Amino acid sequence: MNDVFTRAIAQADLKGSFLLESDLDKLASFAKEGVKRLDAVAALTNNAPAIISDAAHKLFAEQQELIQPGGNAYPHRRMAACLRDMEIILRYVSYALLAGDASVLDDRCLNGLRETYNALGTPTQSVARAVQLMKDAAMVHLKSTANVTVGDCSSLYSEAATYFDKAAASIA
Amino acid sequence: MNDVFTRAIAQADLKGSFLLESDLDKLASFAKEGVKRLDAVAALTNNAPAIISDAAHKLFAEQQELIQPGGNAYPHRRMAACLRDMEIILRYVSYALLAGDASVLDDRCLNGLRETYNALGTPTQSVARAVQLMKDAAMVHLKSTANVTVGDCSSLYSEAATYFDKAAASIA
Amino acid sequence: MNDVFTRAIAQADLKGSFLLESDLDKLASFAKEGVKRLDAVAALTNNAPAIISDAAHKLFAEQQELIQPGGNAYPHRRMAACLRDMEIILRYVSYALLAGDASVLDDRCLNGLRETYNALGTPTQSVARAVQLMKDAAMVHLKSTANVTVGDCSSLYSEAATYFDKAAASIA
Amino acid sequence: MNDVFTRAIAQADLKGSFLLESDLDKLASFAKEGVKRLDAVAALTNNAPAIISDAAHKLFAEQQELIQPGGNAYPHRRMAACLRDMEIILRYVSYALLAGDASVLDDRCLNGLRETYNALGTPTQSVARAVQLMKDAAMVHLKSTANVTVGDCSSLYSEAATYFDKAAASIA
Amino acid sequence: VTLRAPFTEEQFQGALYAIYKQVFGNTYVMESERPTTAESQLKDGRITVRGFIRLLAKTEAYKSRFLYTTSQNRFIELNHKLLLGRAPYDQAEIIRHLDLWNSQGYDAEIDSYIESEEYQEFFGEEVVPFFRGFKYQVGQNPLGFNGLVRLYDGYAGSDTERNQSGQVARLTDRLSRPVREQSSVDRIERLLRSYTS
Amino acid sequence: MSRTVITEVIATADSQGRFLNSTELQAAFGRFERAVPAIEAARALTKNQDALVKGAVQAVFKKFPYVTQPGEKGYGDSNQAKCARDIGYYLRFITYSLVASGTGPLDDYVIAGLREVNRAFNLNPLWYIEALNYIKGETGKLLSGQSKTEALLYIDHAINALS
Amino acid sequence: SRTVITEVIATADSQGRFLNSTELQAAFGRFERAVPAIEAARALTKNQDALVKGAVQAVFKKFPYVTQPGEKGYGDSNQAKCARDIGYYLRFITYSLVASGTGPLDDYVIAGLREVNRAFNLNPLWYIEALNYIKGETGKLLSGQSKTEALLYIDHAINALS
Amino acid sequence: SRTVITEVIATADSQGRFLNSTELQAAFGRFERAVPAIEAARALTKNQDALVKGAVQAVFKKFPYVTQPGEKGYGDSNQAKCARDIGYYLRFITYSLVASGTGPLDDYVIAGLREVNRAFNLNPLWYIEALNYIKGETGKLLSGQSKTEALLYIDHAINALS
Amino acid sequence: SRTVITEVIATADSQGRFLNSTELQAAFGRFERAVPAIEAARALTKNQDALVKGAVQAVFKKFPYVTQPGEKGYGDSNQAKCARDIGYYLRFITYSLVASGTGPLDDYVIAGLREVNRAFNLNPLWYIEALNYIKGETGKLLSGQSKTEALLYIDHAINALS
Numbered sequence A, B, C, D: 001m002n003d004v005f006t007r008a009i010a011q012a013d014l015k016g017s018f019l020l021e022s023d024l025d026k027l028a029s030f031a032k033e034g035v036k037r038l039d040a041v042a043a044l045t046n047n048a049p050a051i052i053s054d055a056a057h058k059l060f061a062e063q064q065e066l067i068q069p070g071g072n073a074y075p076h077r078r079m080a081a082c083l084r085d086m087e088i089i090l091r092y093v094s095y096a097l098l099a100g101d102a103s104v105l106d107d108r109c110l111n112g113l114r115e116t117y118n119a120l121g122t123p124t125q126s127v128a129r130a131v132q133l134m135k136d137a138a139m140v141h142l143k144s145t146a147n148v149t150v151g152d153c154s155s156l157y158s159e160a161a162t163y164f165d166k167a168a169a170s171i172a
Numbered sequence E: 001v002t003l004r005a006p007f008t009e010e011q012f013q014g015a016l017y018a019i020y021k022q023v024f025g026n027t028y029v030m031e032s033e034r035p036t037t038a039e040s041q042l043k044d045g046r047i048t049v050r051g052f053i054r055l056l057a058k059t060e061a062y063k064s065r066f067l068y069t070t071s072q073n074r075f076i077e078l079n080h081k082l083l084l085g086r087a088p089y090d091q092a093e094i095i096r097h098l099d100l101w102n103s104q105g106y107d108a109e110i111d112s113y114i115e116s117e118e119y120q121e122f123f124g125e126e127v128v129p130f131f132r133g134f135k136y137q138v139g140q141n142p143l144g145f146n147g148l149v150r151l152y153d154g155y156a157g158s159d160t161e162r163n164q165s166g167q168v169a170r171l172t173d174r175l176s177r178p179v180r181e182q183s184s185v186d187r188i189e190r191l192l193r194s195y196t197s
Numbered sequence F: 001m002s003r004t005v006i007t008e009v010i011a012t013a014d015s016q017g018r019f020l021n022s023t024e025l026q027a028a029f030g031r032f033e034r035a036v037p038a039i040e041a042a043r044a045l046t047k048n049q050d051a052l053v054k055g056a057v058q059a060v061f062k063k064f065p066y067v068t069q070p071g072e073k074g075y076g077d078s079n080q081a082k083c084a085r086d087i088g089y090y091l092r093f094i095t096y097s098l099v100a101s102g103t104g105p106l107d108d109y110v111i112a113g114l115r116e117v118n119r120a121f122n123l124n125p126l127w128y129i130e131a132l133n134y135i136k137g138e139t140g141k142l143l144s145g146q147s148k149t150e151a152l153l154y155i156d157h158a159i160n161a162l163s
Numbered sequence G, H, I: 001s002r003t004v005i006t007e008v009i010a011t012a013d014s015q016g017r018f019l020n021s022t023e024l025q026a027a028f029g030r031f032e033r034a035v036p037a038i039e040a041a042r043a044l045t046k047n048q049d050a051l052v053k054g055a056v057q058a059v060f061k062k063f064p065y066v067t068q069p070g071e072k073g074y075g076d077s078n079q080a081k082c083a084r085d086i087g088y089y090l091r092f093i094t095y096s097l098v099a100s101g102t103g104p105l106d107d108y109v110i111a112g113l114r115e116v117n118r119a120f121n122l123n124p125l126w127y128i129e130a131l132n133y134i135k136g137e138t139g140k141l142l143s144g145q146s147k148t149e150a151l152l153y154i155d156h157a158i159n160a161l162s
């Protein structure tokens, strides 16, 4: 269960050395910028209903098979499973955003999710499309500058994009 | 597990179709001939020790190598285990007989059984023979016309023969 | 083509001066890392069939319309040409990695791919996705430490990533 | 988990026969010199911490890369894991020595040890070398003529040596 | 192993060792992690063995080993294998426990194991959990025994987080086919119909 | 794994590791004898599926005019069509539960994960309570005797689960 | 390990919910103290060699009986590896400073401490007073926030050894 | 109840351990947020008499059908209960704000929210949009740390209502 | 594509000559044997489902070891793609019958099959026993010359797979 500082510490310990000057420099830079990361995390947190609802709407509009009877999100319990899975993926994406590390996502939430979906007959491709629609809605919600000080967040935007892309690629 | 009622439901659902009139006809027939089915199930139930003891006697008559030292059923703990296994298979056959379909017998009993016996080293040919011997010793109790109204029940006799054959083929 | 040493000699000839001491320093830095370059290219070449196979697996999984009839992979000769394309693009990116100068990939490979796939009707976005999947599959064996002396090679990872990014943006 | 007596009983039972006279002679001879066996077990128990400490000191002097940063036994938790493994294995060798058969080892000590060590990345050769060092440290205590009656115990020495060798070969 | 009312100092340490060896697998527990306050609360009977096991399940050592590095399928399998002794039977259990987790927290998730009816009879207040799926337990599938056999790799082994594989799931593959592969035959025709388009 | 008195008795007997005792056979026979009214009600509903669905959607619009206006869920032609599809689903599972003489089909296929989908798609339960109240009012006249009682009971179960 | 951010993610993952406001407040306060902690890590990183040698000499001074032959301190390897141990402790304390949490200590020295101390017959008092001497040196090497920040981890490890 | 000090003491005492670095950080951080929270608490305590009326008029405007005869919002007693509900809401918002933790908020409105809402047919959307009105108006009522402190608590309340 | 008609027309075009006797006699041959070929193709199109699914079953029965969990043949998608591939093969055999030439087989499935097969570790045998199943059935569904020529084309299919 790792964040960026803990990965840095792990590397410094495998080498057996103290942390190097450049490492402390980049960690201090990350910590100073971290206030903006916290706002990105709060934007994901407070709006996740909206991201999930929009992603589900676009997903089932594109693939109306998953709502057909015999489709894999057909009954109310499977629709609930779909929404809950999307919400958990988004939760662990925001966890990775806070920690600035993909360890929590990859270990806790995606170590064996592909094999689970294959075992249950779930189309992993629709799962990946749900994740990508989630990332699009999350980008739109991160772009929002309401009640916050304007600034440049391209670092956080790229990290969120690569988090969602890692999620999609690990699923499928 | 599913009876034949919920088989009809599930096949109606996974094609998104209401239950047909013909399907309602077969299920109503199942319901009307249900009382004979209850008679058959009670015949299996109330005569369980008789069926099990007869099948065990025949089984240890045919192949003595089980009960002699170094045999699977020998050490008087494994004998109790053998009788308990036969009771379990009889119980699940009676469950499938009351239900109408082998979902109980093929899910709750027969999924992990063949390689369970492979793990234990138990011969499975002997277990399948034991199941067939129980089928023989249970048809005679199932056909007992005493203390009950008389009627044709070849349908249920074929049904129970199929369930015992199914268990014996799965286990072997 | 024009390797890294060829590049240095080219700029020296163009400005008409000798090698500066910093030029010799950076060329010596390239010379010393040549062992790491050998390790990287060996890893890529040995794992090449596996890498291209799994990459094509994720390719056809993500985009299921290419394989099916009417797609540019359907007639199964086009499949052979497709495999040839993946292997050749990985071959030239391995070449560029070995030389350390992206000139060979840009000239010998990427000069005409754009117009070529316009003339061939291939979805080029799909090909960019393909090469990105290549880098994703290859970085696995890249950070693999099996059978070799361990050591940080982050520059090699970044250079391989930049080579694949150049190829992707080219065919994009 | 079977002492000499219960192993003999199991063999007799498999042969469906009473215990032979020669086998009873073997068991009576075993139970006659059993006080020597008790002395050896009490020497492995009373002088256990010295054996673990000395074996660990020799092991970490001879093989230093374990305690280096990045080594397998580097942090405190992994040193404690080393000490507990060695104490457990000495404990199980004492158990086998008292019982008289390696049944306790192959039942409990060595049941899945190689699987555990191949999962943990531990070098099994190092653990085998540690068991060898425990052998050398323990033979000194077993051969301590002081505080006991003088008598030949070469059979116990060979038996305990075989137990330690079996533990090492199972770990290796 | 039990803990009666008049128990003494002896085997109380043994009871603790059995509890740790069961709950935490064979994974080592350095006394930097043993909760001394819980042991003292057990020593006067203010809490039963069931209460102490609830405490251990809710410590950060248990979570560190079984909740963070693992998925939720693996977490449910381990919770069964450790706090109950048996493997899970079907995705009915997995679905119930995962929904209970996401809706009511790890606290209620662990309570569903500890204050359950099954735990009440088989172990109860003063019995340390033991692997009991090897012997036929009433009302099980034939896959409960197979699952406990697959989870349990040996007396020496353990289900440890800190290994090469990263503590991946062992049994969802095993528990996988029966629950949701009855509709495989028709899903085949659906997939072919999609492919032919 | 749908629950039904047959399934319930088989499950409560497998749980205890025992054969089906007399009382479970009593319950099974009771279900078997009540099957005929339930199957009759199921076919009666199946014949008149479309009229009931159309009436239900019209009554939902009538008791909730505000949803119909634009800017709301009720707007949309295909939206309203698959509203009718949704009430068709509800009636379909009512008939399934009648055939099964148990709430298992209804429970599993609708009630399980009901409020979660209602929230995450902002679907008001009161819409569907209106629809099922209209279906109650209709089935009051179609069915009589035991079949009517069974239909009313299952509609009550679904409404209470929604409400 | 176990840091403030990691503890936030754990308490929001075990309870299976999003991050409430209070957890973000804790994160932002941690970000506020980040700069003093990393400055303390800088300062201790520079003076590593002198700190280690001074700690070793303080160990020899406080425990005179350790040095003579037939005892733990005798033999060049013994105090060389004493220096190794002291460098280990100092490195993990700087790690704690950088991570802004007691994680690396608890994972690399605390977890597994008493078993190794009692097996190899080491003494917690040696390292306790050596960390006291490191406290003395960091009293002057640092000032203000970084000073007490380093002191917090130093005496946390001391209480762990005590 | 639940404050930042609540998780401080709970996560410090669950392990039965003395108070280490991290919970001391959390206590200090909670202490520093206290005064902007108090300023915002004063600002939102002054405005309540008009805040409640603004909220009730916002509810009546958003849902035209609720106020018409035959519906929940119509009636003098119904609107009196609306006013009492909004006043209680704002009072517990101030309580959570001053306490620096949503503890009073959580155990006073969240505890028993969904079940009581379905019990008395309280549509959550009514209170969601009322709290949205309060959030929007407090956006101009407060600035700086106070604005964010109020807005995150309002967001927690509305997400609870969802 | 590649047909005896196309072979004639290309082997006349590349030499720029008008057609003479020999190739137009071959054209007579094609046009006379079209009818048996086309009715054979009709019959094969009439019975496809049994052919494909029983071929899949035959592959399982001849290779049980590919069915179990954990190997490549395992998987619902894997069975679906079985049926897909064998359907394609039946497709193209019918096409070749229609064209009265082995062309379309060569153009589509024979061109480059080796390296794509070893690309996914596909065993061509599996398809060979599928073809064996197919010849087993066409020994019954067809009669004489149509049967003979369908057997010829499928045999060529194995030979190319061989």
Ligand SMILES: CCC1=C(C)/C(=C/C2=NC(=C\c3[nH]c(/C=C4\NC(=O)[C@H](C)[C@H]4CC)c(C)c3CCC(=O)O)/C(CCC(=O)O)=C2C)NC1=O
Residues within 6 Å of the ligand: A066, A072, A073, A077, A078, A079, A081, A082, A083, A084, A085, A086, A088, A089, A108, A109, A110, A113, A116, A120, A122, A123, A126, A127, A130, A131, E071, E072, E073, E074, E091, E094, E095, E098, E099, E180
């Ligand atoms: C904590 C980390 C974690 C997660 C999140 C996880 C997800 C997960 N999804 C599951 C099944 C499922 N997953 C889905 C959702 C998919 N199907 C639809 O097509 C969608 C496109 C798509 C959602 C994006 C559905 C519908 C099921 C039910 C399958 C069935 O009942 O047959 C299951 C098994 C039963 C259950 O639903 O609880 C799990 C455990 N597993 C984990 O260890």
Ligand SMILES: CCC1=C(C)/C(=C/C2=NC(=C\c3[nH]c(/C=C4\NC(=O)[C@H](C)[C@H]4CC)c(C)c3CCC(=O)O)/C(CCC(=O)O)=C2C)NC1=O
Residues within 6 Å of the ligand: A032, A033, A035, A036, A038, A039, A040, A043, A142, A143, A144, A145, A148, A149, A150, A151, A152, A153, A156, G021, G024, G025, G027, G028, H148, H149, H152
């Ligand atoms: C307690 C919970 C918490 C809150 C309420 C919070 C809001 C918050 N945002 C801040 C700065 C900032 N916040 C942002 C982020 C925003 N700007 C962009 O428009 C983005 C769209 C958007 C989010 C990605 C930026 C860019 C800054 C200024 C960067 C800096 O710190 O210098 C600050 C520091 C005030 C200052 O620098 O004077 C706070 C307190 N941060 C927190 O940890």
Ligand SMILES: CCC1=C(C)/C(=C/C2=NC(=C\c3[nH]c(/C=C4\NC(=O)[C@H](C)[C@H]4CC)c(C)c3CCC(=O)O)/C(CCC(=O)O)=C2C)NC1=O
Residues within 6 Å of the ligand: B066, B072, B073, B078, B079, B081, B082, B083, B085, B086, B088, B089, B108, B109, B113, B116, B120, B121, B122, B123, B126, B127, B130, E134, E135, E136, E137, E140, E141, E142, E145
């Ligand atoms: C609910 C469904 C279910 C079934 C059916 C089932 C079968 C089953 N039988 C077992 C034992 C056994 N069963 C037998 C019986 C065999 N010996 C002879 O060959 C006979 C012909 C034959 C009996 C028909 C024996 C000998 C054992 C003990 C095996 C051993 O100790 O090596 C065991 C191992 C647990 C134990 O020790 O009791 C299982 C799991 N388990 C289940 O959960």
Ligand SMILES: CCC1=C(C)/C(=C/C2=NC(=C\c3[nH]c(/C=C4\NC(=O)[C@H](C)[C@H]4CC)c(C)c3CCC(=O)O)/C(CCC(=O)O)=C2C)NC1=O
Residues within 6 Å of the ligand: B032, B033, B035, B036, B038, B039, B040, B042, B142, B143, B144, B145, B146, B148, B149, B150, B151, B152, B153, B156, F025, F026, F029, F030
């Ligand atoms: C208390 C639990 C319970 C039982 C036991 C039960 C069985 C049962 N079977 C009946 C008639 C019957 N029972 C049987 C079955 C028998 N006839 C065949 O020849 C076989 C010997 C055998 C079945 C294999 C048949 C065929 C009928 C006539 C019903 C018909 O015409 O379909 C009747 C009506 C006659 C009466 O009440 O005396 C009952 C109640 N129903 C119950 O609620």
Ligand SMILES: CCC1=C(C)/C(=C/C2=NC(=C\c3[nH]c(/C=C4\NC(=O)[C@H](C)[C@H]4CC)c(C)c3CCC(=O)O)/C(CCC(=O)O)=C2C)NC1=O
Residues within 6 Å of the ligand: C035, C036, C038, C039, C040, C042, C142, C143, C144, C145, C146, C148, C149, C150, C151, C152, C153, C156
């Ligand atoms: C015949 C062609 C040839 C090969 C294949 C080759 C590999 C090679 N790499 C070496 C050292 C090395 N090799 C590597 C590269 C590897 N280590 C890193 O961790 C990565 C896993 C990976 C690169 C991505 C490194 C880092 C060293 C140590 C050299 C240094 O100090 O930087 C050595 C010297 C050690 C020995 O002989 O055992 C060889 C032979 N050299 C050759 O002449």
Ligand SMILES: CCC1=C(C)/C(=C/C2=NC(=C\c3[nH]c(/C=C4\NC(=O)[C@H](C)[C@H]4CC)c(C)c3CCC(=O)O)/C(CCC(=O)O)=C2C)NC1=O
Residues within 6 Å of the ligand: D066, D072, D073, D078, D079, D081, D082, D083, D085, D086, D088, D089, D108, D109, D110, D113, D116, D120, D121, D122, D123, D126, D127, D130, D131, E026, E027, E028, E155, E156, E157, E158, E160, E161, E162, E163
């Ligand atoms: C039946 C009784 C029993 C045995 C035998 C047993 C072996 C055992 N040793 C273990 C760890 C370990 N054991 C060692 C010690 C070895 N590595 C070094 O090379 C030393 C030289 C050598 C000691 C001889 C180490 C270093 C680990 C930790 C490895 C790791 O964390 O990756 C573990 C993993 C437990 C955990 O997660 O902490 C087990 C299960 N466990 C048991 O319950």
Ligand SMILES: CCC1=C(C)/C(=C/C2=NC(=C\c3[nH]c(/C=C4\NC(=O)[C@H](C)[C@H]4CC)c(C)c3CCC(=O)O)/C(CCC(=O)O)=C2C)NC1=O
Residues within 6 Å of the ligand: D032, D033, D035, D036, D037, D038, D039, D040, D042, D142, D143, D144, D145, D148, D149, D150, D151, D152, D153, D156
């Ligand atoms: C806790 C219960 C208990 C124990 C275990 C015990 C040990 C014990 N040691 C004995 C003597 C003895 N002990 C030994 C064994 C020693 N020979 C040496 O070379 C070895 C260092 C060592 C064994 C490896 C021998 C050889 C004897 C003399 C008796 C004989 O030869 O059988 C005797 C017999 C009395 C005697 O002749 O002195 C006992 C009972 N006494 C007890 O009340």
Ligand SMILES: CCC1=C(C)/C(=C/C2=NC(=C\c3[nH]c(/C=C4\NC(=O)[C@H](C)[C@H]4CC)c(C)c3CCC(=O)O)/C(CCC(=O)O)=C2C)NC1=O
Residues within 6 Å of the ligand: A056, A057, A060, A061, A067, A073, A074, A075, A076, A079, F060, F061, F064, F067, F073, F074, F075, F079, F080, F082, F083, F084, F086, F087, F089, F090, F109, F110, F121, F123, F127, F128, F131
């Ligand atoms: C098998 C059981 C089952 C049911 C019942 C079910 C209901 C259901 N309602 C939905 C939303 C909806 N529900 C409605 C129905 C409303 N429209 C209003 O006019 C009426 C008041 C009311 C009908 C009474 C509408 C229009 C939507 C679409 C809203 C939108 O996407 O904009 C959706 C989302 C489908 C999509 O992607 O568009 C489903 C699946 N799902 C199930 O799996």
Ligand SMILES: CCC1=C(C)/C(=C/C2=NC(=C\c3[nH]c(/C=C4\NC(=O)[C@H](C)[C@H]4CC)c(C)c3CCC(=O)O)/C(CCC(=O)O)=C2C)NC1=O
Residues within 6 Å of the ligand: D057, D060, D061, D067, D074, D075, D076, D079, G059, G063, G066, G072, G073, G074, G078, G079, G081, G082, G085, G088, G089, G108, G109, G116, G119, G120, G121, G122, G126, G127, G130
């Ligand atoms: C995680 C970091 C870590 C620590 C803390 C650690 C402690 C440690 N100290 C050891 C030996 C030792 N360490 C000392 C330290 C003493 N030297 C002087 O005399 C002082 C009085 C005193 C230190 C202040 C001594 C004397 C020994 C030798 C005693 C023995 O090996 O049993 C050993 C035995 C293995 C070896 O190093 O060869 C360990 C594991 N090991 C680690 O990997």
Ligand SMILES: CCC1=C(C)/C(=C/C2=NC(=C\c3[nH]c(/C=C4\NC(=O)[C@H](C)[C@H]4CC)c(C)c3CCC(=O)O)/C(CCC(=O)O)=C2C)NC1=O
Residues within 6 Å of the ligand: H059, H066, H072, H073, H074, H078, H079, H081, H082, H085, H088, H089, H108, H109, H116, H119, H120, H121, H122, H126, H127, H130
């Ligand atoms: C401890 C803090 C507290 C809360 C959170 C609270 C909410 C609350 N509102 C209630 C009733 C009510 N609440 C409302 C208000 C709603 N209906 C319409 O008028 C409006 C659109 C809307 C308000 C904007 C109404 C009309 C009732 C009457 C009962 C009912 O709705 O069935 C009730 C039932 C018991 C009662 O108070 O009389 C509670 C518990 N009450 C409290 O004491």
Ligand SMILES: CCC1=C(C)/C(=C/C2=NC(=C\c3[nH]c(/C=C4\NC(=O)[C@H](C)[C@H]4CC)c(C)c3CCC(=O)O)/C(CCC(=O)O)=C2C)NC1=O
Residues within 6 Å of the ligand: C056, C057, C060, C061, C067, C074, C075, C076, C079, I059, I066, I072, I073, I074, I078, I079, I081, I082, I083, I085, I088, I089, I108, I109, I116, I120, I122, I126, I127, I130
């Ligand atoms: C023009 C006609 C045509 C041919 C000849 C053809 C060959 C072919 N078969 C494929 C699917 C496949 N087909 C099989 C083999 C079948 N499935 C297994 O279960 C059985 C052992 C076996 C049936 C006997 C496999 C293993 C794949 C996909 C490879 C993979 O995903 O691992 C693929 C795509 C590979 C992929 O999706 O990964 C190709 C190119 N495709 C075509 O469109």
